[PDB]
From a paper:
eIF2B is an ~500 kDa decamer, assembled from two sets of five subunits (Kashiwagi et al., 2016). Engagement of unphosphorylated eIF2 in this catalytically productive conformation depends on binding of the NTD of the eIF2 α-subunit (eIF2α-NTD) in a pocket between the β- and δ-subunits of eIF2B, ~100 Å from the catalytic site (Kashiwagi et al., 2019; Kenner et al., 2019). When eIF2 is phosphorylated, the phosphorylated eIF2α-NTD (P-eIF2α-NTD) engages eIF2B at an alternative site, between the α- and δ-subunits of eIF2B (Adomavicius et al., 2019; Gordiyenko et al., 2019; Kashiwagi et al., 2019; Kenner et al., 2019): a catalytically nonproductive binding mode that inhibits eIF2B’s nucleotide exchange activity (Kashiwagi et al., 2019).
Simultaneous binding of eIF2(αP) to both regulatory sites deforms the ISRIB-binding pocket. The first relates to changes imposed on the regulatory cleft of eIF2B by binding of the P-eIF2α-NTD between the α- and δ-subunits of eIF2B. Such changes appear to be enforced cooperatively by binding of two molecules of the P-eIF2α-NTD at both regulatory sites of eIF2B. ISRIB is expected to be especially antagonistic toward engagement of a second eIF2(αP) trimer, hence discouraging eIF2B from assuming its most inhibited conformation.
Residue numbers in the entry:
A (entry chain D): 177 to 351
B (entry chain C): 8 to 98, 126 to 351
C (entry chain I): 41 to 467
D (entry chain F): 1 to 11, 28 to 134, 155 to 238, 258 to 295, 342 to 444
E (entry chain G): 166 to 518
Amino acid sequence: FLKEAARKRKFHVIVAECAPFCQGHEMAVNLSKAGIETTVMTDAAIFAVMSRVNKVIIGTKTILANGALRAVTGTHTLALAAKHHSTPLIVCAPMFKLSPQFPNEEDSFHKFVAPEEVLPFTEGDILEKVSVHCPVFDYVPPELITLFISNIGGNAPSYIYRLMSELYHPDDHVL
Amino acid sequence: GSELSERIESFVETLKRGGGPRSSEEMARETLGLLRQIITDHRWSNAGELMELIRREGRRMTAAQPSETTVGNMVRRVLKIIREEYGRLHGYAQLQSNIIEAINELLVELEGTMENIAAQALEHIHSNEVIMTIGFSRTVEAFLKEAARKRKFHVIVAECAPFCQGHEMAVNLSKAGIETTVMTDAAIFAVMSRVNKVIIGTKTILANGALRAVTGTHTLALAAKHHSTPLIVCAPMFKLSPQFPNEEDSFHKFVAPEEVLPFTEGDILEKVSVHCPVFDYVPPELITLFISNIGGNAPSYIYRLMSELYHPDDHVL
Amino acid sequence: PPLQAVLVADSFDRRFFPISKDQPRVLLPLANVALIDYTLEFLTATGVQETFVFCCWKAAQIKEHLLKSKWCRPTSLNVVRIITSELYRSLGDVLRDVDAKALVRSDFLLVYGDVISNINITRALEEHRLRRKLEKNVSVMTMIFKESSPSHPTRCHEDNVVVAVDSTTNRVLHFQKTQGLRRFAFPLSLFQGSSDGVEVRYDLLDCHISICSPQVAQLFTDNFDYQTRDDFVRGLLVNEEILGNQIHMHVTAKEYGARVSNLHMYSAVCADVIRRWVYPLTPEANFTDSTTQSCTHSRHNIYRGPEVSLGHGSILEENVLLGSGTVIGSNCFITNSVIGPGCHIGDNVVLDQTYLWQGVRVAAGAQIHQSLLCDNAEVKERVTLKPRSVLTSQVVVGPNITLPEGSVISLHPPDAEEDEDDGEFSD
Amino acid sequence: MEFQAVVMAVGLPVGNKPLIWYPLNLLERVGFEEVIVVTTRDVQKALCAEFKMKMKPDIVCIPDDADMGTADSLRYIYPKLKTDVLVLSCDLITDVALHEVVDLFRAYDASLAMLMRKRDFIGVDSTGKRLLFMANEADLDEELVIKGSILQKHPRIRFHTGLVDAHLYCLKKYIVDFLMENGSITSIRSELIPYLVRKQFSLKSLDIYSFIKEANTLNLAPYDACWNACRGDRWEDLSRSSAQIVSKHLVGVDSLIGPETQIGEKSSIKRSVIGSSCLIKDRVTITNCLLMNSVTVEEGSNIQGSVICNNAVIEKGADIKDCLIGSGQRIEAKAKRVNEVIV
Amino acid sequence: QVPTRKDYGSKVSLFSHLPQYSRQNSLTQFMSIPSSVIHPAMVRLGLQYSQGLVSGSNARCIALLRALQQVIQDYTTPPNEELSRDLVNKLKPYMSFLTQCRPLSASMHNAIKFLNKEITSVGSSKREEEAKSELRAAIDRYVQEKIVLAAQAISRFAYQKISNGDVILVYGCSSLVSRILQEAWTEGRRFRVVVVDSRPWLEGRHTLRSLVHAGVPASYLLIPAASYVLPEVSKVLLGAHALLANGSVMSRVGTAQLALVARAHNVPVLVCCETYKFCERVQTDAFVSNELDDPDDLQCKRGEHVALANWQNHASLRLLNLVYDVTPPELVDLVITELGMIPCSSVPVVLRV
């Protein structure tokens, strides 16, 4: 999306990096390999920089039957920020990232990965009483997004629960 | 003696109708001159008698054009100063000269509040930025072409409609190479998404930060509460008043309806009850950061400042 | 140099009858404020320090109101000299006096008895003095006119004026009234006299605030036929051969200048002073210094004097005024009206676009629209009226007595279209 | 096409070039590929070919009978016409932006657009386009009886008394049809326009628009204005002596003569507009005027301020000033009066 | 052969890509007046689009379609050519020229698209004249059903949501609100409009007139003071000179701001829009597509002087005045289209399927 919509213009791309294990960093290298003015930052100061940002393009993992997608971690706090500064949330998800379940259907809706990436084993004794959570998928609510860039065009969080019936069936929710 | 009364009547008259003194600085300044005149050229045995006298004259000066309180709060501060000097000399002989020297202190401070604000400016602005104001205040234009000689931002001024007053600023600031863009007030929100902060003036700062500004700013305060871009309220400290928002809403200044709907319109003026207010109230909670000749402050410090300057008893004036 | 200004305290086409028999046309409280005060305030603001009020019809009362008023007090920056003379009854007589008694240095305004305005003539006055001294006394009177549109409810059939003015010099090349006329007439050789292009013009409300040089009274007293400024300018504009001395003009954009000549234009300018069209003139400013007129201006122009105490559940639509000490009835309905100081009101009474005045009293049940009620016009129950249904001076109306449109009723048998009573008969 | 390249003029091909070519190349320059023409009408029916000698190989035209009014000529030419019409005059030498005229015609759909370049006093709109009451002086007695309506409609009527017209009218087809229905009028410029502009008042309105101008004007047998119009167009018409052999020997002073430019000396002329096919190279004094083609000069002719016509051989120290030595007078040793010499 | 109208002074930072045109160099100066290139009906349409005589959405679409009727039913076909090819090929420059002389609103775009589909419908099946008169009848049935019947059904709908005793509020020459308020006053249903307005194209005068000439006790006050009336404006009834996919109502620059102050003041909103202004695109900000007009009209005769007479001689004064902004669907509390009183969040589906 960006490195095609930025071979005409040149502008500000503030790539946060996923703190559990840096994910946006190869993103930044790949973007900069065309010179797009990419600024990498640690995901803990978004509410600092959010007020000098215009369009919030977030890449998501999958969507739901509310529009309330769940994406790479730290996107829910980015959504709370980018609504506290009322910027748009220009999601970019093709069709096949859309599953007709509902938000509170999965016990541990997230996907906890090995806490070894949050407090590596080489730490020591303090690893005896530390519940080192690591939920690498966070759950955006419905009302924080505004504009799905699906590969049919733009859409809104209330032209999704019909993309179900246009793509799936009612009784394939449980599969 | 009668020269007192004649300059009083001249002041009251040019208050009721007279355009100019332009900068509220100048209104307060000629008010202070008249205050000195009253407070040297009259008779009073006790100081409380002068309290009562100046209270009478301030009551008349404010109930003349209650839409303007710079003169009213100047009267209230002078009454505070007489309270001060009487307390100092009670816990009577020459306190007159003490009054006059304190007033001269007040006046020399007033004459420099604008440069205080100017010097305080540059700690809030930095390049690659876009700033939005409204209307026209001398304080704000001083602010901006002060911060302009160090770096070149992009100011976006929204011309008020009842008077293209902001227009003037947009010319003035264009005479510092400052990237001024003039937008029609309606279109505020249309560009509210690319204004990193707003700088608004006032003509009053009521007793809870609920300023009262040129019309077309409550919309600005709300569109900047929305985007959470901040309101730099560049209000020199002397613009306060110990009055509170909800008071009989003879609060705006309903200017002649010729500004909106010209008289040459025609017959339709039979029942078209036109309106034209030039003062939009603004509530506190939208106000982010006050500036003043003391420094920076929060809309909660304004009550401290009001209990500071104006002795809380003379709010009825 | 100074600027004296004459206030001709009565124009001399006596029309407000029987209104002009209880109190003069100038003592008329437009909005609880004698017209004389609006005139004097216009004078004081526009730059005047020197006024002379030549009062004719019961001038004693115009004085007794004026002397104890503001300007006649020494604290005024505008000197008023009540030059009273019950001798004459034509405006030309006033002009001939100010000629013979040498009461002008130069540039003395001429204002009628009741002009309502807030015009700043400083631009007009500057151009006046300029073209005077820059063309050596050729000018006589520099007229000032308010841009309007031919149907605004102020300029009615009475004084719809028509001008033929130049483009740059702004002199009145031609002039005529249109009260009962449907065509127009000019000389072609006049347009030869202006080859750059004359301009006929019809969108000018006449402010009656044309600035008068001393040469005005000069060229006036030479004749006797001239007896109204209209006649004056007609003469100056027909004698375009021998020293015509073109009357000059100037059109204004913003400020509002009109004259309460007739009850229709009176109601128009009342409901247009209420609507703030003449800021600062608006009764909350109380430019007439008196605390019996503290108009605590409210939302929707619902004015309210001190100590009002209106009724119970009574929508006041807009433009309402309420004089001091009044009282309104429950489930009343006022709109666009004006009430008077200390004037009772009854229960279940609608008052649309009316104009009550001082002392009046309306008991329950009545319904009044577009009318007027002069002083102390006590009224019984269950009474309706019609557009322009004036009355005057204590004429109690009996119950269940509907009146048609021009229902002018008062004490006068042969002038008022009925007689004073407490029913609708028994002269 | 939807527009019409029609012309209208009576009473000719004098001047630099024939009086007809200038509107022709005007039109063919401002679009108007085809060019409709109404030719000789005076007494004959044969000068069409003599008008057919224009460099542009496109011409459509008719000759006619002795006397025909302009309204009469238009009702006459009604048959072969089918659309929006644009009447012009061979007697108008202007470089106007006519596109603006048809602009103010089309944008507002006014029934008729006229042009007037600074008799003929008009009363026009408060904003400069929609004329309201036009006439000439001798039309109405002494007054301007302005119908109270049109002042109730534009309470600021701005006038134009010191102004001359141009006679170039774009007329909607339906007014052409209604005119053809009516067989009383004869003159466009006199009685067509005021008829419309008076019936404009009393939805469908027959709006009519006027365009003021300060560029160029029309000319008749008093070509006095035409000589100076051609003075300007000699700055214009070369791209809007001149186009011939250029010798630069004698006094060519803002002058222009066609081919056969006799190369001689001892001759002079100022503020001149000369013609071609002339045996004028020998000694002569100034002219200080314009003149048609086919002239001659010899033995120090002291001509002045007049018109040297076509097909003449005049020479030998003459004395003339403000006297028309035109068609049918040519001698050598003669001093002419300074008054109006009919020749 | 199609010239362009050059820029006018200096744009704004974000709008170096948006267009900004001048109200004086209408291309009708440098086109051969007997326009054998563009049908003079189309040129007349473009021109009287420039000067701003016809303004509103409905009005502009009616004008475009009347010009298309006027040219089509007088179109001439070339031989050895298919109608639905030769027509659109002979037509594309006309739409290009119209865009040049003035941008195309949403209504006009959807009208052009409908006409393109309708032209693709007909073919050599009929001879030229048959399909031609057919196209004409089709355009006329469009002009009927999509706007006139639209206004009718929308008035019948909104007549439910106007209570006897309240007020309403409007914004500018939105034809539908004029019709709604009028027809809602004829049925004995009392209210009291309070129009607002903006500069430069002060247009609220239009609805103000059209109301008082029909007995609607209106009131007028400029838009920056609108935030004073809302303590009493018991509804809000905006127009919508466009509609977009995500419920982002694109309208005149004041509607969004007004709706925002209305939301914050706690009074309902009700846009009104028929069902062809739904352009099939989406826009989330007020900058990706707007139209800067001839900007030299901001200057006011305030006091004695035009405050910017030398608008362009300053090196760094740049004036914008947008025509449309895009109010977001968090604020649009209704969309009264003829398909129903659909709330704005559910518009991406109704008007699309």
